[model samples]
Target: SHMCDAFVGTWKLVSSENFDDYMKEVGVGFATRKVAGMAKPNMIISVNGDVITIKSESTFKNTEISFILGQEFDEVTADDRKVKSTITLDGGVLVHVQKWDGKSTTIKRKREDDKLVVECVMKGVTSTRVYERA
Candidate 1:
């Protein structure tokens, strides 16, 4: 949390794969896509088991993601976009249930090659973000 100590650490954005197409599928505009493509996001993940939370900050935006590890909650993006999602953990994998205005989806994150890789699914399309060590 931004105010607590139970969950506090710094995470860096590594390399990303499959995100280009993912963003395209999401209908992100070309200019935004270009900016997103070049940005390296820093993520902070904190969890008190059932209460999971995250913070992602970059040149583009600074935002938080919070929810119960196995329960659903509402999510509001830094851009003011909103969604509903549930967070969970399976071994080392951080999983999520994402719900938008007209659809529901899933997201998964794992570590590989010293990088954190994020897979977000929505509207039947899947996108990826890979973060490297800081």
Candidate 2:
């Protein structure tokens, strides 16, 4: 698997499956979940040297995170929680792990043809989101 600069671009949300269940498993409130579920978020990714920046934007909220590959850092999730986060590349997939209060969430991103597939797992609940190039 190759870890190249292929992920650096803007991607618009195409579809999300089981995202509500995943959010509920993470303790999101009903109101917040409702808004988040209705949001069509776009992700902008940039790679400069060893650092990668991810910006998630939507009408509900926007979040930007940057980190060096294989290095851990503090992260404020889109739901406004602070966690320790790390990113890694494995088998052509970008893997992100966020831990807080002894619980962990894992998100994996990979390219499938012209789409970006994001798989998020939290507390054994899994959600998949697909994005198309914008």
Candidate 3:
């Protein structure tokens, strides 16, 4: 039932599919989408007490969020969208949901041995990204 321990580590993005479509569905501009398509990112995740801190590092830009499970917090997404986000542990998956302007997106990070399986969804499009431990 505890997923935080399994997610506590640095991870490198290795592959992604349909991510561009997901970003486009969320209104990311062409230039920004192309830039993201060209750059791969890494994640640094840590757990402390009841809070978890997740950070995304990339050549283009970086983002980090530290939050207590199930609590909503204001955040600025990579595409510069202002949203309220929440994180919850469901089985071995970390469920992250962001909401803004009457729209919402879900990013689920699942544990798979030494790799992290990321599933991103917006509207009806789903993007999958795989990250290996770094």
Candidate 4:
């Protein structure tokens, strides 16, 4: 994240809506998706000068990605998929776009009610996950 000062902190996942369907749209395997559904990951969005780092930490897996705004870089997802990922900040929202093979997905995160509201979309499936500060 780290769209601005509003999104630079540690956040704990509190709720997820339609996450399994979203994973299905992303072509995640059934067993992996099932195990992931039970995982409650914590997100840490940090910034060092111009580079922004976002980390997803959980018992199942830990994924860390870094990028500057509007820059594209190779990203390896938790599913072990290599993709072209871009990070952007628009209207105070941190937007993440991942392109792999011929498919793509987007994640938009914003601060809502003093919490992080993460919205992820792949094709026609959309999932929303809420996070509270730790």
C-alpha RMSD values across all candidates? 4.3, 1.7, 1.4, 1.8
Per-prediction tally of clashes: 5, 0, 0, 0
Per-prediction TM-score: 0.75, 0.95, 0.96, 0.96
Predicted structure 1, TM vs. truth: 0.75
Tens-place lDDT digits, model 4, residues 74-113: 9988877899999898888889999999999999999988
Stretches of model 1 off by over 4 angstroms after superposition: 1-8, 78-80, 123-125
Give me candidate 4's TM-score against the actual structure.
0.96
Candidate 2 C-alpha lDDT tens digits along 1-134: 22557898999999999999999998889999999999999999998777789999999999999898899999988787799999999988999999999989999999999999999999789999999999
Poorest lDDT segment (10 consecutive residues) of candidate 4:
1-10
- Deviation from native of the Cα of residue 85 in model 2, angstroms: 0.3
lDDT of 1 at 13: 72
In candidate 3 the C-alpha lDDT for residue 85 amounts to 95
The per-residue C-alpha lDDT of model 4 at residue 79 equals 78
lDDT of 3 by residue, 1-134 (tens): 34588888899999999999999999999999999877788999998788899999999789999999999999998888999999898876899999999999999998887789999999999999999998
| Whole-model Cα lDDT of every candidate shown, in order | 0.69, 0.91, 0.91, 0.91
Error of 1 at 129 (Å): 2.9
